[PDB]
Amino acid sequence: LRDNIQGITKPAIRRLARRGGVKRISGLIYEETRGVLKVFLENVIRDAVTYTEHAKRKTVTAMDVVYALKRQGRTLYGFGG
Amino acid sequence: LRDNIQGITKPAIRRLARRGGVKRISGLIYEETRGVLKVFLENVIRDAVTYTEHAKRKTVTAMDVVYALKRQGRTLYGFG
Amino acid sequence: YRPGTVALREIRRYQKSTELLIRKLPFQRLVREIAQDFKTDLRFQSSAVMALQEACEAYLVGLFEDTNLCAIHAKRVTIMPKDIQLARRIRGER
Amino acid sequence: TELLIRKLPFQRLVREIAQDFKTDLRFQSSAVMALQEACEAYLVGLFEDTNLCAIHAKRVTIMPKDIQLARRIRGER
Amino acid sequence: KTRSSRAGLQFPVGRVHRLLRKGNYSERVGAGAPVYLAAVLEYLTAEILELAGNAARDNKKTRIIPRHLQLAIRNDEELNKLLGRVTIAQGGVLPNI
Amino acid sequence: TRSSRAGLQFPVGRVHRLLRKGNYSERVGAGAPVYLAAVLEYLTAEILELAGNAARDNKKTRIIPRHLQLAIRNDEELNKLLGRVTIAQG
Amino acid sequence: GDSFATYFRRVLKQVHQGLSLSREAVSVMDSLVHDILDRIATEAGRLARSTKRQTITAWETRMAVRLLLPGQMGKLAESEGTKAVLRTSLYA
Amino acid sequence: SFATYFRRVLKQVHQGLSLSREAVSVMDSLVHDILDRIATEAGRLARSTKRQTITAWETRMAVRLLLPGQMGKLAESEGTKAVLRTSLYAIQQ
DNA sequence: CGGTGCCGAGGCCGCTCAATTGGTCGTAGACAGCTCTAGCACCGCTTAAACGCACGTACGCGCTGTCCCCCGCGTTTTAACCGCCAAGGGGATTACTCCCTAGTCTCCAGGCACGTGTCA
DNA sequence: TGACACGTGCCTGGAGACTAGGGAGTAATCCCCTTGGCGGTTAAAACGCGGGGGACAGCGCGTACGTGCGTTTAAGCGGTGCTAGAGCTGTCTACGACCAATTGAGCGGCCTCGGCACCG
């Protein structure tokens, strides 16, 4: 699907950080946080896909994603478990 | 035992800092790091003494301390 | 009107709410493109993509609050890539 | 690599904390040594992080604010 | 009858015993373990509900939503320490600057 | 022995027994404490080679826990695998 | 199903009778209860296996709760659990 | 545990060295910890799939989860080689 | 603050399946007894580590000017999105079975400990 | 001088062969949910321009910290002895797994209703 890390638009990052607590954001923050988000997404999706490969499935389930997130110490509650 | 937190003396904290990689030390670092060490000891010792109490043992052993460390998140190798 | 007094209002109105902040379709395309290089021709449950979005959003919000902590500690209000790098280094993720 | 905290003061400290927790307790030397090693490792890691914080703020000394920030970012408080 | 009524617990002792046995945490499970576990779970859940209800009343809403649960969890120091590495879905953050 | 048929210096046995005594599941398959033994043998052959390299670098020959800590902390993958680990007298 | 929805509603009515839960809140709190149960069970099992014991009785769960819930909340939960066990033992 | 099983490995890799008592007592603990981690991950995966057994598939996925691609692929290759060698030996009896 | 609409939460009945109840038993663990490790307390010497100042300067912190780079805001583009539909791929169930792992009788042979020669 | 390699001997767990039963492998089968497409519409992102504020660097002050040296001290050392209690064995009984029969507590279907959102 070519590239889609640009799908996290600059206003989206701005609103995310603004909810975080910041009040001024430097121009170079956007590329760094896009890289950080891509790294974290790769880390979580690799585990959530190895879980599916184990289950001999072809559809990544919410249970797979929540198990992958739990394995990294970032538990998620609203989606079963 | 009264006022035994002073056993972690100032040169010991300074040497720990030098091993950590710092180059200069502010005077108020010593009280803060003594407090940090006291908090860490309290947590680990509470876990260890609960471990011994479960085993109905009056002596804390290396296995209980390493179990407390592993539970807290810092696994320890070389004692069990 | 002047620079400021609008970022604070945005913080007030965005910390109170809980709605998703990353657009759903771009994030779906992003997760699809990331997962397509591990296993090819995969399918994603809608709840799975939503869970991934709700986890990444929370993680990024936490990282941004930590990087604001770092920026304030350096006598600055503007967060810069050095702040994010230091926050991620101290957190141990690296 | 050698032990930095003196053995006897640390032993007395850990005994004091334990007797604060549960009275009439005994410590075998392996447990005290393991605790000392863990505390040395934790403190050197904390000082690594605080040196990073101090360098970040255009400083070479570490101040209590640096330790507090390192602890708060690490999560423990 | 039952075991929830025997111990005076709202929570199900039998269900938590079944969860203990199914999870395979040990080869054998004692009789007092499920009762104790139901008791502690009921107390913790009652505390969380009370805090979330206080938050909802403060927010002037009679329906509890995950935002109120997140507020209750991250407003009390003990709950925050116990559940600090957890992201409640649609939970948000408590407002601070 | 099954270590004879396998190409394993690490014991296929004494790992099946450890799995059974650890109660990680109701039953353990036949190939599990062979794949696991091979993985452990690789994860020891590496680490041992690195510690030997460190000892040769320090001209000490004998392997000391300091060498093990250097081996673990001097490689990115092993650092990620063992990051919250403190080695005694290291 | 395996969910504590009715128990959460019952305890809310006991504590805050004027309120009412929502399905999302029920789901997240069910997951929270399951996670706390798993944590306590794993700690108690590890304690039991530490002392060469292949059973997880009231002592192991009590120590797991005490060792997993530091502070005043841990003392209150332990007192509540001991009260429940004593009340159960009173049926004799 | 695993006393001579490290000396055997050290005999074929970096010949002329030896393992000290402290090094052995660290490495056997490390091997036990890694084995426990992989076994717990395999058990959790099997339970998630609703299977009550640990087979080659479970441990394969457990080491894929633990060791990422740069090294987990090598460990997976080694384990597959060992499993197929055992199977070929058992084929002819 | 008031008027209107929407729908998910609440309450009553069917019921069924998971929780109770009762009896068996064979083992896991409670309990008593005993030995010997090693934990604790103390004796004194010595010396390495801590402790107390003096001090000269490295450096943290405040002040000030700049110039540039984010913020606000208006406008245009553009892609989310919400509503709806077609299609089928794969999640999820279910019956048969068959092969694999639990369990048990040997049987020894690799594993562990020890004595001795030899080198780090 | 302590530790590794080569005989020497003991020893108990891995292993071979067998039995038994059940875990799940496998083949159909249903239909839920996911992907792809169409289309208006419209909220939001992209872009540009003016401007203010603030990040950064330079400069000066003054303060507090690392270094050195003399004095104090208590850690570590090595015995010495006393005895708690860890660990082990022996054993015996209480209990949790197991199974068969029973039943009522909570789940789902269906009808009510007020809380939440929207606008004026």
Side-chain angles (χ1 to χ4, degrees), chain F residues 1-2 5 14-16 24 28 35 38 47 51 60 65 71 82-83:
Chain F
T1 57
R2 283 134 69 190
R5 43 202 50 170
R14 311 225 310 161
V15 167
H16 197 349
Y24 301 101
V28 179
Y35 189 93
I47 286 189
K60 211 65 69 166
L82 308 113

Side-chain angles (χ1 to χ4, degrees), chain G residues 4-5 15-17 19 21 24-25 27 30 41 44 46 50 52-53 55 58 65 67 77-78 82 90-92:
Chain G
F4 301 92
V15 152
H16 264 310
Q17 94 287 350
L19 260 71
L21 265 86
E24 295 104 34
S27 191
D30 213 296
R46 168 195 328 279
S50 152
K52 290 140 183 84
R53 252 49 152 156
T55 196
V65 152
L67 171 153
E78 280 198 273
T82 52
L90 267 196
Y91 262 54

Side-chain angles (χ1 to χ4, degrees), chain E residues 18 25 27-28 30 54 64, chain G residues 2 16 20 22 38 54 56:
Chain E
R18 176 166 77 73
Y25 307 100
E27 313 201 352
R28 314 159 100 241
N54 284 0
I64 280 171
Chain G
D2 200 319
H16 264 310
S20 35
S22 43
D38 181 69
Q54 46 174 325
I56 164 176

Side-chain angles (χ1 to χ4, degrees), chain C residues 50-67:
Chain C
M50 222 73 80
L52 257 170
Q53 185 169 355
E54 300 273 6
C56 289
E57 218 191 48
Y59 163 71
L60 261 191
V61 158
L63 172 77
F64 272 127
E65 85 191 15
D66 289 351
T67 206

Side-chain angles (χ1 to χ4, degrees), chain D residues 15-74:
Chain D
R15 256 167 225 281
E16 156 197 71
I17 290 185
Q19 79 97 2
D20 179 27
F21 272 104
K22 175 176 145 79
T23 204
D24 265 357
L25 211 54
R26 267 158 134 77
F27 273 75
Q28 68 176 54
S29 37
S30 34
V32 156
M33 285 330 152
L35 252 168
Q36 178 148 11
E37 301 293 340
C39 298
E40 296 255 350
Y42 165 76
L43 273 201
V44 300
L46 188 83
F47 279 139
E48 268 161 30
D49 293 354
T50 63
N51 190 24
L52 285 192
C53 263
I55 279 308
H56 164 62
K58 282 140 203 89
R59 254 194 288 106
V60 73
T61 76
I62 41 183
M63 316 217 90
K65 27 187 259 189
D66 288 356
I67 287 172
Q68 270 126 29
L69 171 61
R71 299 248 319 290
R72 164 171 331 131
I73 297 203
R74 285 251 283 285

Side-chain angles (χ1 to χ4, degrees), chain E residues 21 23-27 85, chain F residues 20-21 23-26 84:
Chain E
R21 286 210 270 95
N24 198 280
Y25 307 100
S26 273
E27 313 201 352
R85 317 289 223 269
Chain F
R20 271 160 23 129
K21 104 156 173 44
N23 188 86
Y24 301 101
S25 279
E26 287 234 19
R84 319 216 73 171

Side-chain angles (χ1 to χ4, degrees), chain C residues 37-63:
Chain C
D37 80 40
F38 296 138
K39 206 168 135 67
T40 293
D41 296 40
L42 260 202
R43 286 161 102 80
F44 272 80
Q45 264 194 19
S46 286
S47 71
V49 153
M50 222 73 80
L52 257 170
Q53 185 169 355
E54 300 273 6
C56 289
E57 218 191 48
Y59 163 71
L60 261 191
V61 158
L63 172 77

Side-chain angles (χ1 to χ4, degrees), chain E residues 48-65 67-69 71-72 75, chain G residues 12 16 18-20:
Chain E
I48 284 190
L49 264 305
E50 183 230 338
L51 296 182
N54 284 0
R57 285 293 195 199
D58 209 328
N59 194 267
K60 264 172 291 283
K61 273 182 199 332
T62 36
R63 180 159 280 107
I64 280 171
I65 44 184
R67 160 69 160 177
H68 305 161
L69 250 61
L71 249 55
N75 256 0
Chain G
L12 171 85
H16 264 310
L19 260 71
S20 35

